[PDB]
Ligand binder design. Structure first.
Ligand SMILES: O=c1[nH]cc([C@@H]2O[C@H](CO)[C@@H](O)[C@H]2O)c(=O)[nH]1
Ligand SMILES: O=c1[nH]cc([C@@H]2O[C@H](CO)[C@@H](O)[C@H]2O)c(=O)[nH]1
Ligand SMILES: O=c1[nH]cc([C@@H]2O[C@H](CO)[C@@H](O)[C@H]2O)c(=O)[nH]1
Ligand SMILES: O=c1[nH]cc([C@@H]2O[C@H](CO)[C@@H](O)[C@H]2O)c(=O)[nH]1
Lengths: 303, 201, 299, 298, 302, 262, 300
């Protein structure tokens, strides 16, 4: 109610291929192919809407049925998408994935339709939000715009990929919270993360470059959280049986931002976000439709 | 050199012919592309070179609308595909009798959209300041009223005291000194036939 | 559960128009919603926790695909529906009160042969709900090949309900209104006094159960075995009259499958109708047995 | 958009004497005072809904303070009225020679009192607190801020050290030479020693440091790396009282307006200059437009 | 050539290679295990020495016998390693490879190559003809080299995608970068899915100050681009790959050797491609028969 | 002053640790080989181990000798290179110098082997060499080679269920195996004797972070005149101590520490 | 509510050339700005919220009608201006970097006693009269002799054009000269800032009521014949273009007189107007207002 979250990210059409028993590179093996809504920013937005947050998605889609399906379904998930960009002439971004996991391919060129001018057309709206969530799928110039014209509003940035997260390197002094993985953080810092011993030096590198809060996900080991103010620590993983690994980081980011707007401490926010990730893990769907604050709180309580 | 632009609306027309009132009166129901501006454009494709500046929703209705309108010759690249709203609709009881309109996406056709870019054609569905905005930016380069709430008729004129009428305006690009069809507009209408009217009587 | 309900009805695209005050272009709201008597009854049946299978016809157009997708999303199995390439999805235009138009020709695509392809399945159901939107031959087939399974028939309209006249001896529960029953019987219903004579006419022609809706007056129920009576209307705030009879029919059938007495089935069906009225949408998604039970509870 | 600013500070009665041997006749002035109260008034003058959470002593003086402050556009309905104590006071012998401060009612601002207005504090845009209150109260505010920025005014060198272990919970701190020296323990005897003092503050978790070094200017520093110097706006002094309060008000008002650090420091310096240019503790002509005007002429 | 030299600041690893009908996995799996000299910088040094260049290696090794063995082996290959650092307490860098799967690198002694250590050999570095650096060293060391190059061209090998970002804001001090698809995608942030977006990637690099870009693409070729406007494609020299290791090192060696010999950009790229081709045809990381004459033979015979 | 012979392999162990292109991690160069490890672990025992001209071999041998192992009778052959063992935790093994141990090499120290208390043998040597040891053991206890068939009768010391382990163990005893110490993990260490005392032993609680130290324990307790069960307790403690350390052989592994663990 | 100000002055077309000159085909900046002392003062007064009427002379050139139009759009009533057919509107060429000066102003002599006599009724009913020294001795004589007790503020414009006011100081309410003009008139030397006070005494002895001398090395000296004398402190400003300053000063003084403001403070306000004039590259600062000038003098 007058408090909202703006997400500038990508909205993709996800094509997922599953094969019966084990799948090997040779021969055509029958299985299940799914067309599901996707895109880091879109997923984060949907999960935020599911967490009882007024989420506004600022993405770019095409004039094809894929785009309209994305927009309609996303709006139907409680996400305000009236300010989204529909580009007439270009194609909706796509993501092909062989899950279980083999190589993932992404055809995302409409993400560059999200421009400085487009965001500038929605200035003040972005500047009057509680939190701004951006992903590294957009253009470097757009990220620059958001970070420079945030107007003292915290910007939470999702790295998405290791080759796409360098765009915020020279700009870490403008990011409120980065959640990279091992490969991503190794890529950014240049320091090897070959252990649980080597995360202090990476965190130190990030803080020396101006990063306020770092949420480094180190698989098995857990999630290492660090604040530039001196607050460092480790968080243990919440025991869960996997079904689909897709959507973990998105649920984490949604949780983190929702917990920031809820006036929650860093560590507690890390546990809660880990709970959202855990709920994402337990679902076959990219986005758990039953994802709620109550369920996540129950999960962190009972574990 | 000469380009024609119609800043009008594009609706989805649902027509009905009923011919108790409570008991389901049998008849015919047709789903056809509508909208004043879009119709004008379709009849400006009388061979004119037209461009449509209308707003449609991001639904199957809007996309089918722009598809049909595109195949009709008109260029639908400058049209605004609006997110968060529905395609304009028009309920016509024909045989005229009663007419209802669900047109709120006309708010997307605002002065900001009109800014970024022979005869300018517009309707009264357009918001106040937008209409007035193209009334300020006419630049001496040369409307078609719909109803009282929204060329004209005495009905709507005397309250303050355009489709088929609207394609004829092409005569101002011709230097000329001053109906019964199932398909909403004729699929192969040419000016030579309108002249053939005179050739007969 | 190997217990299911088969519904042979129509699936229309309903276009509803609401305005301010008609001056004869009156501004307002035009809504495109899924419709059709059989389809609606099917959805309501699925909402009452009955495994409902719809046997209808759609027109291979986006209208049809939308109808099927939404209806399936309402929990209704639509895999046995007919998708006809050449015809158009049936349509229903309403100026809501004033003027109702129906364009339903694909309803004749629901044929005896088509149903014969789904015989046994139809014959192995608990109840069959059919509407008078289909052809006389199709209704004749269903009634002749019911295999001792009760067939609940919705008259839908007065002009298309006469086809069940000479076939009333094969009908379990018939649910007509004033005009429909007047047309069928030929006896005037001008009052609460002439309903005994109409019930007598219907039963003399072989109708097992008659559920005559007389609006204000209430709902008069009658059995050929002798159990007759009136049911008082549950007074409710009007919002949308569409879907009332559909929800009532759904209630009657759902209550038959639950081994419920005639009168109680009528009361429950009346509750379903009341829930239908309290919603602007044709089908209330929150329609449940518990809620209806609550509604009868305050009455 | 429901945007407001909450100030937890002190409200004092300022008594100034104008004229150390003989009985000296002169003029005695009774003016509203207190760091937090002044900041609140200046914020109200800068077009911000400011809510003051202070304590008064049921005295006619206190009621007068509340009325005057309300007339300055500041909401004082949530202030604490303590029955038994006296409104805090500040006495000055100007000719400045003797300065005395009697503020014990500042301890009436407690953790429980603030906890009664928690959610309200947690739904504010900015929190401005002063070091006149108890360490426990400051601890409450800083611990229950709910990710809402807390701007802390050091007030005095002996009263600022209570935030020295809570610097990691403070957004913007605005100390002078003696205050920052006392806190850090590092001498500011140079213009080079601001790098090491700022570094000390940053090692302890401070986000933003706004060190005012009189003549020299204002050195600003962010823990993310943005450091720099701002030249002082040279002005003809008249009364030095109220400068830092207007500066703090300027900084917070610029935070709620989405303004960069350095630019906010200049704006705050302009507010300070307007305060200096006034005989009054609080300049009644203090506005965004006027401050913008002197900042243009620079 | 005489009293003309090249300084290489790189890594020196001990490479442990495991060779496999199939892989038995657990419960042992017979095969062949080879210990060969390695490390990008070291390899570049050897290849440069083979191309008739006076090469000085500025690396760091561990007081383990491996380090002295490395230094001796490199010295016998004609490489001056007298200025290398021998670190007592640390272990010689290592690279484990399961050839065909698994690749592991244990290189922390690469951080012993520091700004101070190089500062001790400044003047010498500043009197070289060319400086070859790799991205295995510390960011501070790279910063030092780039800041104290004294107008001597710095050729930088990215080595890895996660280790090349250390030069991303320091590209304005680099004379020549030799990245692959993934490395250039990582640095630029621009997708290399096409051959049209290599113009866009090159444009990105040039906007950030890179003088010369030599983008090595597996297939399709090597795209070369100059900030001065000279862009073009070079076709790959078809060869039967025996072992792919050591290609880029020979490429870099070729590029630098061709710079000091006053050769045009394009021809230098072709020559370097010839060095890569000779590297591919050998089982060893470094071809001992690598010469200017042989490369010339390979490129002449297209 | 006059009281063990270990005939085993001596490998160069290269260990690769990597987290779950180019992935950074830890590569350790440690002395290795089953026989070498057992020998080192045995050494409060007087241990004799029965390599190439490479530096690797001399470093390995000196390391073992400084670890208290007498290696003067080990074979240093200047014709081949020291054996190697690669482990990425996949295991690759380059062991051909272990085949240099031939009948003449073993026969040259026959008297010495036959005057020992225990003989420790490995399943990596040739069938003919193992045959030599088992046939020329001279009533001295001899402690994955499937060729061991029909040769079980000369060695001192399917499984889907735990009831059917009786059939496999009984099978081993039926083929002439005297004592069986089967390591399964979960259950622990199952011991079985042809004389009838059979049983299961639970694992000594440790975090994995082994078998060579186990064998070393068994033999060391045999020479210490200790019953089978207690020997199993000690050997399991040795296994546990091996597990709690990153390096191949725990330098703090002692009888004093292991008895403490039990 | 019919109180207005009448300005009898010159209207020039100012062409300014900047180019930091011995050769040919040398690129630079050429600016076309409306000018003329009287016209500029009038415009500045109109910007200060004064009803200003210009009584000037323009030529049959369309440029002149355009001039009048631009000035009218600046809020100055120019309907009483003289349009002489057959001749051209006066022009002023200036080559700055001031370096070179050329002036074509002879239509300024078309401003005659008779022309003013047709607008006598109107001129005598103004609050203040602003005249420039671009006009004829006969016209100036007319204005000063037929002022009918209405204050006449006269700008000297030039040193050679400042001689017409000498023996006629007894008819002037306020003169705003520079160093050379005042020296030429007085006969008292200019050197230094201290032994120059007697110049004001000379002016007052000849009957001058108010004197506003602009001096360098900080200081604008104001003097009244009643004894009211003083110096004014300079407003530190960034000199973008010095053109149009004195016009803004005179405009300020007159506007402050009609608004009932004291002498010294009127001089300060005028200094603020000059400061606003200096901050503009254009001859006339378009944002010149009472509020902005008050802000600038306040912050000083
Ligand atoms: O490079 C990208 N890969 C994948 C995604 C999307 O994010 C989802 C991961 O949760 C994924 O399913 C894909 O849709 C993306 O946005 N960019
Ligand atoms: O003739 C008909 N009229 C209306 C309907 C449908 O019945 C519904 C009213 O409850 C409505 O959905 C309409 O579509 C029909 O099936 N046949
Ligand atoms: O110790 C203190 N002395 C003075 C003040 C107040 O600050 C004002 C000066 O800015 C002043 O009004 C005084 O009351 C205070 O809060 N604490
Ligand atoms: O991270 C690294 N991996 C591999 C190498 C070496 O580069 C050689 C391949 O060109 C190779 O021999 C390896 O040792 C390195 O230096 N750093």
């Amino acid at each position: 109610e007058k408090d909202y979250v703006v997400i500038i990210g990508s909205a993709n059409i996800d094509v997922a291929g599953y094969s019966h028993e084990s799948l090997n590179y040779a021969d055509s093996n029958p299985g299940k192919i799914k067309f599901t809504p996707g895109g880091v920013g879109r997923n984060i937005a949907q999960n935020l809407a599911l967490l009882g947050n007024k989420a506004w998605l600022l993405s770019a889609v095409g004039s094809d049925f894929y785009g309209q399906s994305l927009l309609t379904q996303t709006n139907q998930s409680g996400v305000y998408v009236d300010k989204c960009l529909i580009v007439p002439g270009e194609n909706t971004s796509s993501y092909l994935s062989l899950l279980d996991m083999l190589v993932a391919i992404n055809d995302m060129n409409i993400s560059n339709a999200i421009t400085a001018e487009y965001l500038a057309q929605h200035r003040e709206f972005i500047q009057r939000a509680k939190v701004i969530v951006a992903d590294c799928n957009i253009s470097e110039e757009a990220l620059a715009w958001i970070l420079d014209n945030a107007a003292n509003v915290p910007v939470f940035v999702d790295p998405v990929s290791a080759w796409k997260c360098v765009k915020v390197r020279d700009r870490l002094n403008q990011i409120h919270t980065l959640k990279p993985n091992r490969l991503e953080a190794e890529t950014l810092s240049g320091i090897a993360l070959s252990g649980r011993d080597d995360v202090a030096k990476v965190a130190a590198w990030f803080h020396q470059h101006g990063l306020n809060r770092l949420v480094l996900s180190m698989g098995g080991d857990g999630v290492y959280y660090s604040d530039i103010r001196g607050e460092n620590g480790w968080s243990a993983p919440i025991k869960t049986n996997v079904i689909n690994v897709t959507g973990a980081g998105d649920a984490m980011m949604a949780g983190l931002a929702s917990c920031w707007v809820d006036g929650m401490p860093f560590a507690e926010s890390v546990r809660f976000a880990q709970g959202c990730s855990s709920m994402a893990l337990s679902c076959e769907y990219t986005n758990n439709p039953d994802l709620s604050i109550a369920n996540v709180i129950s999960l962190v309580e009972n574990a």
